[PDB]
Amino acid sequence: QIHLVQSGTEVKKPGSSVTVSCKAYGVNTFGLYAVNWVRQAPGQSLEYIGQIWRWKSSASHHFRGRVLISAVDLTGSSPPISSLEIKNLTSDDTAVYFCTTTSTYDKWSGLHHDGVMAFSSWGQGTLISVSAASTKGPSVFPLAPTAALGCLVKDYFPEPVTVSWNSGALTSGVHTFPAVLQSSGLYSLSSVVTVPSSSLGTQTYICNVNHKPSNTKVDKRVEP
Amino acid sequence: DIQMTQSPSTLSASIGDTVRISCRASQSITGNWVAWYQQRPGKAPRLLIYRGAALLGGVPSRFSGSAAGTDFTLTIGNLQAEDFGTFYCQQYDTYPGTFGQGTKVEVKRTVAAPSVFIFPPSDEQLKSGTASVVCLLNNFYPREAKVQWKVDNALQSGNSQESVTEQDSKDSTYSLSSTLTLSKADYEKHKVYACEVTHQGLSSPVTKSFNRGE
Numbered sequence: 001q002i003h004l005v006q007s008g009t010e011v012k013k014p015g016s017s018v019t020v021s022c023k024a025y026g027v028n029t030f031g032l033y034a035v036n037w038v039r040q041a042p043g044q045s046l047e048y049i050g051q052i053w054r055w056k057s058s059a060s061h062h063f064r065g066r067v068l069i070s071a072v073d074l075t076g077s078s079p080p081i082s083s084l085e086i087k088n089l090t091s092d093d094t095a096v097y098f099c100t101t102t103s104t105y106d107k108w109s110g111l112h113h114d115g116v117m118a119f120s121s122w123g124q125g126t127l128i129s130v131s132a133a134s135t136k137g138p139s140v141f142p143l144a145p146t147a148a149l150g151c152l153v154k155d156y157f158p159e160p161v162t163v164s165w166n167s168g169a170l171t172s173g174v175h176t177f178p179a180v181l182q183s184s185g186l187y188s189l190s191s192v193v194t195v196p197s198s199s200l201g202t203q204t205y206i207c208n209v210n211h212k213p214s215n216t217k218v219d220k221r222v223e224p
Numbered sequence: 225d226i227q228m229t230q231s232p233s234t235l236s237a238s239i240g241d242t243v244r245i246s247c248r249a250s251q252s253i254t255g256n257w258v259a260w261y262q263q264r265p266g267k268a269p270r271l272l273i274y275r276g277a278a279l280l281g282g283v284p285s286r287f288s289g290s291a292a293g294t295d296f297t298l299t300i301g302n303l304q305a306e307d308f309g310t311f312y313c314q315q316y317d318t319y320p321g322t323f324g325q326g327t328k329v330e331v332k333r334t335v336a337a338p339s340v341f342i343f344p345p346s347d348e349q350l351k352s353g354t355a356s357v358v359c360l361l362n363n364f365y366p367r368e369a370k371v372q373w374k375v376d377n378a379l380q381s382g383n384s385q386e387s388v389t390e391q392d393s394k395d396s397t398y399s400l401s402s403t404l405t406l407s408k409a410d411y412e413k414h415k416v417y418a419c420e421v422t423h424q425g426l427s428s429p430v431t432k433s434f435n436r437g438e
C-alpha cells in the first residue's frame with residue numbers, strides 16, 4: 001500500500017531557496033514509478049510543476065530554470081525519496097506543494113500517455129509560505145454582547161492559533177472563522193458564540209487562545 | 225497548452241441525488257486522456273476516474289465518466305455524505321497536463337436568513353491604538369451574501385475583509401464575518417457605523433448600526 005510522506009511546513013523569506021522532500025513508502029523503485037510534482041495556491045486550482053520519469057527529470061515552461069527535481073532509490077532505513085528544489089522564492093510561490101506517483105510499468109494502462117499522465121497517489125502536501133514576517137504572538141480582544149459574543153485574535157504570525165471556550169466545556173453554537181491575511185502580512189481571526197440573552201449575567205464566558213509558535217497562551221473573560 | 229473550462233462552479237444537491245459536472249477542452253482529445261479527482265477541505269485530492277471512463281481500484285461505482293465531442297462529464301449517482309466537496313477535471317493528452325478551475329458540490333437546504341450582529345471596537349483595542357468593527361452573519365443559507373460598510377453614511381472601500389466558515393455538518397448553514405479596520409484617529413472622528421446585508425432570505429436589505437459611545 002502506497003503512502004507518500006512529505007516534509008513539513010516551511011516559512012521562507014523572499015529570494016531564498018527551499019527543498020521539499022517526499023518519502024515513497026510502498027514504492028519499489030523510481031525505475032517503475034514516475035514522480036510528478038503539483039502545487040495549489042490558496043483558494044486556487046492545481047498546477048503542474050515538473051516530473052522525474054525513467055530517471056529523467058524536467059519542468060514545465062512556467063518553472064524551467066528555477067526548479068530542480070531529483071529522485072533516489074533507497075532501502076532499509078528509508079524508502080525511495082524524491083525532492084523538489086525551488087530557487088528565488090517570491091510571494092506567488094506560496095502554496096501547497098504535492099508530490100505524486102503513478103506506476104509506468106504497464107504501457108497499456110491508460111494512466112499515462114508518453115510522459116503526460118494522471119496522478120494515482122498523492123502526498124498530504126507541504127505548505128510553503130513565503131513572507132518577511134517574523135514570529136509574533138496575538139493580541140486578544142473581547143467582542144461583547146439570543147445574543148452573540150466572541151473574541152478577536154489579532155496580528156499574529158505564523159499560523160495556527162487554536163481557540164476553545166470555557167476550557168472546552170462550551171462547544172454548541174461556536175463558530176471559529178478561518179484566519180485572514182491582512183495588508184500588514186500578519187494574520188487575524190475571530191471566534192464567536194451565540195447564547196440565550198437570559199444567561200448573560202448568570203453565565204461566565206472565556207475564550208482560551210493558544211499560539212504555540214510564540215509560546216503564547218491567553219484566557220480572556222468576555223463580559224457584557 | 226490545452227484549456228479545460230469546468231461547469232458549473234458550484235451546485236447544491238441532496239443525499240441520493242444524481243449529479244453531473246462537466247468540462248470542455250479547448251481542443252479535441254481523441255485518446256480520452258482525461259481524469260477526475262475529488263478534494264475534501266483540508267486534504268489531498270484523490271483520483272477517481274482516468275482515461276475518461278475507467279474507475280480506479282477502490283472507487284465506488286456510483287461514479288462514472290462520459291464524453292461527447294470536446295465535453296467530458298463526471299456523473300455521481302446516489303449522492304452520499306462523503307461525496308460532498310470539490311471536484312477537478314484534468315487533461316493529460318498533451319504536455320503539460322492541465323486542470324479545470326473546479327466544481328464545489330454542497331448540501332441543499334431550505335432558505336434561512338442570517339441573524340445579524342455588529343460589534344464596536346473594545347476599549348482595550350482602542351487603548352492599544354487600533355479600531356476594528358466586526359459584523360457577524362450567523363447560520364444562513366444559501367451562501368451568497370453581500371455586506372457593505374458605511375461610516376457617516378460613506379461607502380467603505382478597501383479597508384475590509386471577510387471570512388466564511390465551511391458548510392456546517394449538522395444544519396448545513398454558513399456563517400460569515402466581516403471586519404472593518406481603521407486607525408484609532410478616524411474611528412474617534414465619525415459618529416455612526418453601519419453594516420448593510422443583502423441576502424435571499426431577507427425581504428429587504430438589513431442594516432445593523434451603532435453611534436460611537438452609546
Ligand SMILES: *[C@@H]1O[C@H](CO)[C@@H](O)[C@H](O)[C@H]1NC(C)=O
Binds near residue numbers: 065087
Ligand atoms: C535568481 O536566479 C536568477 C536567474 O534565474 C539569477 O539571475 C539571480 O541571481 C537569482 N537570485 C538570487 C537572489 O539568487
